Design a protein around this ligand. Sequence first.
Ligand SMILES: *[C@@H]1O[C@H](CO)[C@@H](O[C@@H]2O[C@H](CO)[C@@H](O[C@@H]3O[C@H](CO[C@H]4O[C@H](CO)[C@@H](O)[C@H](O)[C@@H]4O[C@@H]4O[C@H](CO)[C@@H](O)[C@H](O)[C@H]4NC(C)=O)[C@@H](O)[C@H](O)[C@@H]3O)[C@H](O)[C@H]2NC(C)=O)[C@H](O[C@@H]2O[C@@H](C)[C@@H](O)[C@@H](O)[C@@H]2O)[C@H]1NC(C)=O
Ligand SMILES: *[C@@H]1O[C@H](CO)[C@@H](O)[C@H](O)[C@H]1NC(C)=O
Length: 602
Amino acid sequence: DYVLYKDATKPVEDRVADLLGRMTLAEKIGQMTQIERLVATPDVLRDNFIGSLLSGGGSVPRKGATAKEWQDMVDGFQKACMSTRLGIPMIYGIDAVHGQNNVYGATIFPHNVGLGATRDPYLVKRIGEATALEVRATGIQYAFAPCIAVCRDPRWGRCYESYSEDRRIVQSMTELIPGLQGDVPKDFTSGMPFVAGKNKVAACAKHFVGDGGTVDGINENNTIINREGLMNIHMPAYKNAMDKGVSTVMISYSSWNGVKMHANQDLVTGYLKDTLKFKGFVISDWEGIDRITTPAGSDYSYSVKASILAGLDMIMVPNKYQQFISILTGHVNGGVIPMSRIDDAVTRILRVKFTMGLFENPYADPAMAEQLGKQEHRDLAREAARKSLVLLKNGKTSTDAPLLPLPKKAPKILVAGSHADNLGYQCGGWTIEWQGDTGRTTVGTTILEAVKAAVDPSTVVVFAENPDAEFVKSGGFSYAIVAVGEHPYTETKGDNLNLTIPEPGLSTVQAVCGGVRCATVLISGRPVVVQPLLAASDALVAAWLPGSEGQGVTDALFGDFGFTGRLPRTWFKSVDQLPMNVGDAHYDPLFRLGYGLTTNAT
Ligand SMILES: *[C@@H]1O[C@H](CO)[C@@H](O[C@@H]2O[C@H](CO)[C@@H](O[C@@H]3O[C@H](CO[C@H]4O[C@H](CO)[C@@H](O)[C@H](O)[C@@H]4O[C@@H]4O[C@H](CO)[C@@H](O)[C@H](O)[C@H]4NC(C)=O)[C@@H](O)[C@H](O)[C@@H]3O)[C@H](O)[C@H]2NC(C)=O)[C@H](O[C@@H]2O[C@@H](C)[C@@H](O)[C@@H](O)[C@@H]2O)[C@H]1NC(C)=O
Ligand SMILES: *[C@@H]1O[C@H](CO)[C@@H](O)[C@H](O)[C@H]1NC(C)=O
């Protein structure tokens, strides 16, 4: 007879109830299971009824894979899932957090701390739109973004995934979500999941909650703050996410006052689901339930009980699915987890799959392949990079001639420093590899290439990565651009207690700037100890991690556009002040939240 869940004209809630009432226990637990593509096979997916797959950082079908290799990979997994008895399509997730950043040739946008400096929610909406197209070009339907952490200490290794220490800036940057997912209807109820169709992706607000609040910015550690602090600093951007229809929420590894978020029923069920009325699904982080215990994974059976009873809907296992499925079936068969907690989880996963069009369009669209790296996207990324630059200094004294903007026509100019010609340093973490990498890892324009592309044909451009002082003073340069800063890092590898840049950084600047007037371009994921760089430089520009389109840097240096960017964070004087945030008692910054100098276009 007639199968209502297969009928595309029926309300979402009727299709969900009709399918759910057919599923066995194996089929329901399979929907809650997300696994990494490395352990997936057609039989695994079909015999375990798997609901979701992901790529972790750097988990790609081949190095250099075109958009169509990605599509064929995702479709081949999808053909296995559509061949199960109920034919429930999988959803494939990926970290597309500054563009579709795992994929060769994708447009790489500025990381989020630089987007905070723009103060333009409309630009960030546009980046979400272009991001969704490049994720759908590879066949993927779900992005793990945005991170709406409110980083409160720049020593954290994920502070550059945070838009700001100020939760008001983070709130206004939740406009990424309707870029990624599409604008919600006039009809719309806060906390419903929404995706507009096959040119959009499901999004993910992460990581709930207080991930940027941890002690000493230690990654994954303990956020010590009282309920009012939680609610007035770390929480509010979640409620803006509910109003824009964010489809999924990801739970943090971090604790709140000693309680693991992955075992917190009060916050996850009591607040997120029952007070904000979130109706999408809640997904764990990568081996988040394992880390509930110390050592991690020492009582997996407890990890499964505590996290499913806290309210988590989908578990990113993501390798050992056999142990997860066995233990979870055991607890349900023993009465330890009731059936109604399972049916709630599966209801939520199915709600998002039906709402986004997945049952009607389970397969990739080959015509979307040419969205990847599209030029109009690279122009948008160029505009973002340019608006994220903060001019901190433009002249060594208040009576000096302003160095920027620089003339395009000069007899001879020097480009120096370890970041002047290194695409991987300019993009930072979460770019091609999980940790990012060095060198020419993808398509884009370095600073040196941007300089060659901008100057008059008669200007001679010399490059030296680390020139000595005598080379600079005898070379006859009119000016130098020197680019230095942090190396790429992600997560705990970026936790950093000293906040000073690797050498050579300071000594290249000192050599270059001692011989010729210099503009210093600092690439970093956060504020770093800056005083010595400031003292040597005529001009100093915080460029953050501007991504693949380095002509956004030279657009402002050479005066096609003015500088407009403003600090999205406090710049400290020393690491012994930290944490120090707008509002604190000991507030004594080198540069306040909100500072930046401007220029006008020539
Ligand atoms: C302030 O705190 C941080 C603590 O995190 C500290 O930096 C960390 O230092 C660790 C060692 O003590 C280091 O681990 C070692 O890494 C070695 C290889 O490191 C290279 O590759 C990694 C991975 O890609 C990069 O992140 C590194 O930055 C490094 O990169 C090379 O760096 C040199 C120097 O500039 C450059 O010329 C190369 O071209 C460049 N190559 C690449 C690929 O980029 C391992 O082999 C070893 O076994 C250790 O595990 C961490 O990498 C590093 N963290 C980061 C994110 O940088 C920092 O330490 C200072 O800086 C580092 C780079 C090193 O030169 C130290 O001697 C120095 O003290 C610390 N600062 C102070 C003042 O204490
Ligand atoms: C925080 O870090 C320390 C190691 O520095 C660890 O012993 C402690 O258990 C961590 N706390 C949490 C909640 O992870």
